[PDB]
Design an enzyme around this catalytic site. Structure first.
Site, PDB file in Angstrom:
ATOM      1  N   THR B 126       0.847  -1.207   0.000  1.00 52.20           N
ATOM      2  CA  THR B 126       0.000   0.000   0.000  1.00 52.20           C
ATOM      3  C   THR B 126       0.877   1.251   0.000  1.00 52.20           C
ATOM      4  OG1 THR B 126      -0.327   0.371   2.355  1.00 52.20           O
ATOM      5  CG2 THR B 126      -1.792  -1.258   1.381  1.00 52.20           C
ATOM      6  N   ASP B 127       0.234   2.386  -0.182  1.00 51.36           N
ATOM      7  CA  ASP B 127       0.876   3.722  -0.132  1.00 51.36           C
ATOM      8  C   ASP B 127       1.066   4.132   1.329  1.00 51.36           C
ATOM      9  OD1 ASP B 127      -1.696   4.498   0.615  1.00 51.36           O
ATOM     10  OD2 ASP B 127      -2.000   5.899  -1.089  1.00 51.36           O
ATOM     11  N   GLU B 128       0.914   3.205   2.286  1.00 51.87           N
ATOM     12  CA  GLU B 128       1.328   3.430   3.693  1.00 51.87           C
ATOM     13  C   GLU B 128       2.850   3.244   3.768  1.00 51.87           C
ATOM     14  OE1 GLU B 128      -1.607   0.286   4.492  1.00 51.87           O
ATOM     15  OE2 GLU B 128      -1.516   1.030   6.544  1.00 51.87           O
ATOM     16  N   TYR B 151       0.481  -0.241  12.235  1.00 51.85           N
ATOM     17  CA  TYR B 151      -0.235  -0.822  11.057  1.00 51.85           C
ATOM     18  C   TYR B 151       0.681  -0.730   9.821  1.00 51.85           C
ATOM     19  CZ  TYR B 151      -4.074  -0.307  14.349  1.00 51.85           C
ATOM     20  OH  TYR B 151      -4.855  -0.420  15.451  1.00 51.85           O
ATOM     21  N   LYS B 155       3.264  -3.428   7.294  1.00 56.64           N
ATOM     22  CA  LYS B 155       3.344  -3.385   5.804  1.00 56.64           C
ATOM     23  C   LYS B 155       4.818  -3.210   5.387  1.00 56.64           C
ATOM     24  CE  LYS B 155       0.196  -3.676   3.961  1.00 56.64           C
ATOM     25  NZ  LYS B 155      -1.044  -4.411   3.633  1.00 56.64           N
TER      26      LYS B 155
END
Ligand SMILES: NC(=O)c1ccc[n+]([C@@H]2O[C@H](COP(=O)([O-])OP(=O)(O)OC[C@H]3O[C@@H](n4cnc5c(N)ncnc54)[C@H](O)[C@@H]3O)[C@@H](O)[C@H]2O)c1
Ligand SMILES: NC(=O)c1ccc[n+]([C@@H]2O[C@H](COP(=O)([O-])OP(=O)(O)OC[C@H]3O[C@@H](n4cnc5c(N)ncnc54)[C@H](O)[C@@H]3O)[C@@H](O)[C@H]2O)c1
Ligand SMILES: Cc1cn([C@H]2C[C@H](O)[C@@H](COP(=O)(O)OP(=O)(O)O)O2)c(=O)[nH]c1=O
Ligand SMILES: Cc1cn([C@H]2C[C@H](O)[C@@H](COP(=O)(O)OP(=O)(O)O)O2)c(=O)[nH]c1=O
Ligand code: NI
Lengths: 319, 319
Positions: B126-128, B151, B155
């Site tokens: 993800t873009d996290e 969180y 990732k």
């Protein structure tokens, strides 16, 4: 100092026991709870037990035992040394690293978050990780370099989660990174104690691959002192590198131990299959920890290994 | 290209089911094994079942089921979408992200390594997470920025382990990162389908905190196309961003969906507690994927939401 009741995870192990004995002899006011699963690299005889030192048998993944311990013993500081150690070429080896290093650390952090009363969470990490500093602000880490093997990836993953507990919830973390440690109380499966004990039992030194792999080696006494200084003086949220300049290949180490043992290097070396993974250690600086007042007190590697050789001669039967 | 027998983890979920339907529809000779634990956000109704699509019920942590699946179904490709989704303010929430996102991914990588015949391990991220490249011309990532919440930390941890399997063992990995996805087959607990289903069920829209948090929104059809293109033409070992310029606050999205629903924003909005953690998303480009020949086919956000509103009217009883 600002420590009355401390929980030392992995306190029966190599670095943990050296730290526990340093705290118990320096600070006779501090209650020390050694929290340890007691696996084969651990030994009760590593620790100098007194009325301040207590043993709790448990896994860092035991949420309910940890919660019981923090509340019931009013813990102010966690000193987390309980990382996975045993490397081998067998399937699933690296999975146990994730279970202990990433998931186990995370259980400790979440317990600490739910407890809400910790003054410090000290996370011990290694020169398998390289934290890049903000060029703006040298107190601040912005990124970790991409680990080249899954063992090192679990160390990086643990550091990201530890730091995120401070950045999200203000849990008071400090991270320290260390070179390879040598000294008393190390189970003889890592290079230096394995080779010392092999040389004491008449047997050959197993050289994995070429023997050209290089590490920096720091004395356990210098590590215990650095951790003490960082816990008591460190800036909450920051990372401290505990690096030395003391770089030796595997063959360099074999040469020194053979010299100390009064035996020839050639006819001591048996060549054995390489590890299957990319094994890269970073030179980490020690400027920040020096600004705290830390000084490397064991600089003469040769002299320290002479003493340690003799220490294993007397004490290796313990393992 | 290479895809004959593919294992799609999380293939009953939102993005996975869209990818399965895409591969089923675009190719006629790809066998797809949908590998899924069947959590409340999953639906067998999400997948267009055919002769080439089979369900294996399982956890990605199930080493022995994965090993049986790889070997007996001669899998050439893993397409790994089974990440943990469910965010709330409850104690231990983030722990399940470590178990699924870090440990689960690691089980799949180790199974893949032991199997030894995978042609591609595709990891959806993800873009996290944001990484920095060595040089403009070579575009290899050398670091991950330090995440600000646990969180996002899980990732980042997953990506470090996935890449390390390529760097140590030549496991053929590609990573992709995505903005927030919207489309058919999403359980109504993420922003867009929760708000659409609340509008249809006549209920109030929950604004967490101020409602000024921003996301970029990409259509699932565009994501499935990008993943297919990256699997067939991507460079092994690299990371690809899958990400449009389509930035909106929560309140911007609530206003668009209220307009589409024929209702006024004021009197639809209830304000509820913010998330307890620090969440900022890195702005990613889609140049690398444009070079493989990807083109965003679903560009008109409002037009797509009008159609999506219609689809939840008809199908939301699935959930
Ligand atoms: N030894 C080194 O050269 C070195 C270098 C840098 C830093 N470190 C760091 O030092 C720490 C300890 O290393 P060490 O060499 O003393 O290791 P060690 O194996 O001697 O000690 C680890 C201890 O933790 C215990 N333990 C393991 N998993 C546990 C679990 N799930 N729950 C509870 N207890 C558990 C073991 O029983 C053991 O007593 C680690 O955090 C590591 O990152 C190691
Ligand atoms: N964005 C990325 O997209 C991917 C998928 O996102 P989404 O919006 O489609 O999610 P989603 O929640 O709609 O679907 C995820 C799917 O994974 C399954 N799943 C979850 N944990 C599992 C486990 N341990 N083993 C097996 N199956 C498991 C769930 O049942 C579900 O079908 C993620 O990897 C995320 O990083
Ligand atoms: C234990 C041991 C290590 N080695 C090599 C492997 C490594 O290059 C180096 C250090 O290994 P080790 O002491 O296991 O430490 P680390 O956890 O830092 O990998 O010594 C041998 O060649 N023979 C041995 O018997
Ligand atoms: C589901 C939901 C999300 N939000 C907000 C939280 C986030 O700021 C944003 C997107 O949430 P979400 O769709 O859960 O996406 P992400 O996993 O990227 O966080 O919408 C609300 O305000 N209300 C809601 O009911
Ligand atoms: Ni008690």
């Amino acid at each position: 100092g600002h420590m009355k009741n401390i929980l030392v995870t992995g306190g029966l192990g190599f670095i943990g026991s050296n730290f526990v004995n340093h705290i118990s002899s320096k600070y006779d006011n501090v209650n020390i709870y050694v929290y340890d699963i007691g696996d084969y690299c651990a030994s009760v005889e590593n620790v100098e037990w007194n009325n301040r030192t207590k043993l709790i048998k448990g896994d860092i993944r035991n949420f309910d035992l940890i919660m019981h311990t923090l509340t019931e013993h009013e813990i102010d500081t966690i000193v987390h040394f309980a990382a996975h150690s045993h490397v081998d070429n067998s399937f699933k080896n690296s999975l146990a690293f994730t279970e202990t290093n990433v998931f186990g650390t995370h259980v400790l952090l979440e317990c600490s978050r739910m407890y809400g009363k910790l003054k410090l969470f000290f996370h011990m990490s290694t020169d398998e990780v390289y934290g890049e500093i903000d060029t703006t602000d040298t107190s601040r880490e912005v990124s970790l370099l991409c680990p080249t093997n899954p063992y090192a990836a679990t160390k990086a993953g643990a550091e990201h989660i530890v730091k995120s507990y401070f950045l999200s919830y203000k849990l008071p973390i400090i991270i320290a990174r260390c070179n390879n440690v040598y000294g008393r109380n190390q189970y003889p499966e890592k290079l230096i104690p394995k080779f010392i004990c092999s040389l004491l039992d008449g047997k050959k030194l197993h050289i994995q691959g070429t023997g050209n792999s290089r590490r920096n080696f720091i004395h356990a006494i210098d590590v215990a002192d650095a951790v003490d200084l960082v816990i008591n003086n460190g800036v909450i949220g920051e990372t401290y590198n505990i690096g030395v300049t003391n770089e030796h290949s595997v063959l360099d180490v074999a040469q020194i131990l053979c010299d100390i043992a009064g035996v020839n290097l050639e006819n001591q070396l048996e060549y054995v299959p390489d590890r299957l993974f990319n094994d890269f250690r970073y030179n980490i600086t020690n400027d920040k920890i020096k600004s705290l007042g830390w000084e490397q007190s064991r600089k003469d590697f040769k002299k320290e290994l002479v003493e340690l050789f003799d220490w294993y001669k007397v004490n290796r039967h313990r393992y």
